[model samples]
Target: IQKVQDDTKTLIKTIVTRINDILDFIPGLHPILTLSKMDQTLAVYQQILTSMPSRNVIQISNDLENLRDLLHVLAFSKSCHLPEASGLETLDSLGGVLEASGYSTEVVALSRLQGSLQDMLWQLDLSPGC
Candidate 1:
């Protein structure tokens, strides 16, 4: 039981650190640009949870749900204000070669982050981010 407490504490600490970082909230920075940092942070989160069991992840479910909601608001508001793109963009991988186009990289990357958040929450069997 003590060991479980230790692990959950570590998980929550890592998540909380990222949350703080994301919310530094510079007035000069566009929300989309801040999203770039968020995407990188989520990558760290994904790695930390790799091979981590669902039962343990459930311990951090509230944090995941909460962060996902924040991500949705930032991603959605920015996407609506974002200008539309005209052609093929990109994917999870920056492959050696792939067609690319219209949507700004910031917009695409933000949406990708939101997508990954949902994927993470669902994998942990928690309520979906609203």
Candidate 2:
């Protein structure tokens, strides 16, 4: 009796979904691109974009701490003094994304994308030949 009742309920639930798909069957709705669907997608586009989670907030904090601490160390030690060059890449350099994979730490994640002095200086022409 229990098994029979469960089977009937399952059948009832499944039937709706099966028929629902065919009832609303519109040609090229999902499988093709069309004019009507283009502009009507702004709301859905916002939802999709918002749903895309990001980690910049936490990463920036972590990277900020990392930078501060490292800088503090250098200042406190006062044993190393040098001048060098680097670049701060963001939306410009592809090395970070290309050379990294999963399990990368915030250090690499933050710095890799945008943390260089020489390159930015070179581009800005402030510190040429860097």
Candidate 3:
């Protein structure tokens, strides 16, 4: 349980940092960049963990999985060298990678996992626990 909590927290922090840093130059993603919100969600998760009577190991584990998936997609983006790439040429390069990887499929699926996790955190409803 402790291991999972620690890992989940770490993954959350890592994803937040990676997205915050990488998304800055990804003009197409500028609208969806939610750095502050992600940070807020992490903070809320920590507070809930401390205040709760017993941590829900299962829920935290699930959260960790979702965060891991998001990281994987970010890894794909990093592989495309999005941070240093830009402009129309960069978009073409990114598009090729995304399509070759199955055209939004990977990103869309992973995003759903993160979305559910975010919804729970935003509502302050850690009923799922941890």
Candidate 4:
């Protein structure tokens, strides 16, 4: 459980870093920045885990499964290439914005993180009560 928590935190940080790095090229794009669905779930998961003296295993399992699904979506978005970069795209038809940013690494990282999260979720008792 501790390992999963720690890995989750690290994965969120990495994803945020990649987004930040990608945004650097787009000067006016900063206002549109937002957390991914998985990142939002991560924040909620962290809040619940930290506030309670004892972690709710079933709740965590459900959250982890949700997170994994979000990650899968992110991976698919990234895999679609330029249009899905950081889940954002500009008005340029030449795909200039995506061409400027190094998005391949971000896509690869999302896939790897999704796999890890899915593996963790698979180990949990999804049908159990919270």
Candidate 5:
């Protein structure tokens, strides 16, 4: 179980990092190209999704769904950011999204995709090293 938890944490971190890194490239780019990052992020997610165990796969699926919602947000939300302040501020807000949506519907269609990093930690229910 500890292994599972650790693996989940790693996967989550990697996916988040990739998404944020690509997000820095957005803004001022064509909307079509901006949307391409969605696919890229999803592709990285697919890798993480496959790496997860069957019993613990729901988190990735829910994340993918929430990502889709963010896609809509990415596409239409005026609040979306671009390459500003070295893109750090932009990605930071997204980090906030990951933190905020932990307990609420992250996306419109899939309201169940909300929760916190703490929740992921709790889901592990494991000791430090098993």
Candidate 6:
């Protein structure tokens, strides 16, 4: 029980921290600390559950689902508007290499992030600077 509580608390803390870091309201800086860190956090949660079966895995699973849902909601309900390719144009520079690797999953995932940001920009209904 104690272990479950500890793990769940840690998981929620990490997720909330990232969510708070999300740049909002004016697009000052990228709020997300590091995508790699976020991925690592998720991996840690999964690993914890797998390593301890007696734990209340259900709560951990629920927390993960809730985190995903909240993130998707925030993505669509963004308030700040940032210009496209704002420091992200470098992804284009890797276009040939990414495609050459034949890793469709990675390619598609990268494409989704860029495409979603573009789509978010269009959807924000910004008037000039906003």
Question: Which has the greatest TM-score?
Answer: 1
| Candidate 4 local lDDT, residue 123 | 34
Deviation of model 4 at 63, angstroms: 16
In order, the Cα lDDT scores of the candidates are: 0.37, 0.28, 0.36, 0.36, 0.36, 0.36
lDDT digits (tens) for residues 63-102 of candidate 4: 4455545444444444532122232132233233224344
Best by lDDT: 1
Instruction: Provide C-alpha RMSD values for all models, in order.
Output: 14.6, 26.1, 17.6, 16.9, 18.2, 15.2
Q: Write down the worst ten-residue block by lDDT for model 4.
A: 24-33
lDDT of 2 by residue, 70-103 (tens): 3334333444432321223342343434334543
**Model 5: worst 10 consecutive residues (lDDT sum):** 23-32
lDDT for residue 74 in candidate 2, whole number 0-100: 34
Q: Report the C-alpha displacement of residue 45, candidate 6, in angstroms.
A: 1.9
Q: Pull out the clashing pairs in model 3.
A: none
As a whole number from 0 to 100, the lDDT of residue 22 in candidate 4 is 31
Off by over 4 Å in 2: 1-60, 82-85, 99-130
The TM-score of candidate 2 is: 0.23
Error of 3 at 18 (Å): 0.3
TM-score of each: 0.29, 0.23, 0.25, 0.23, 0.28, 0.28
Off by over 4 Å in 3: 23-130
**What's the lDDT for candidate 6?**
0.36
- Alpha carbon RMSD to native, model 1: 14.6
lDDT of 6 at 57: 47
lDDT tens readout by residue for model 5, 11-102: 54544443334212212111123433433444433343443434334545666555444434433433444331122323333433333332
Model 6 lowest lDDT segment of ten: 22-31
**Model 6 stretches astray by more than 4 angstroms:** 1-40, 79-130
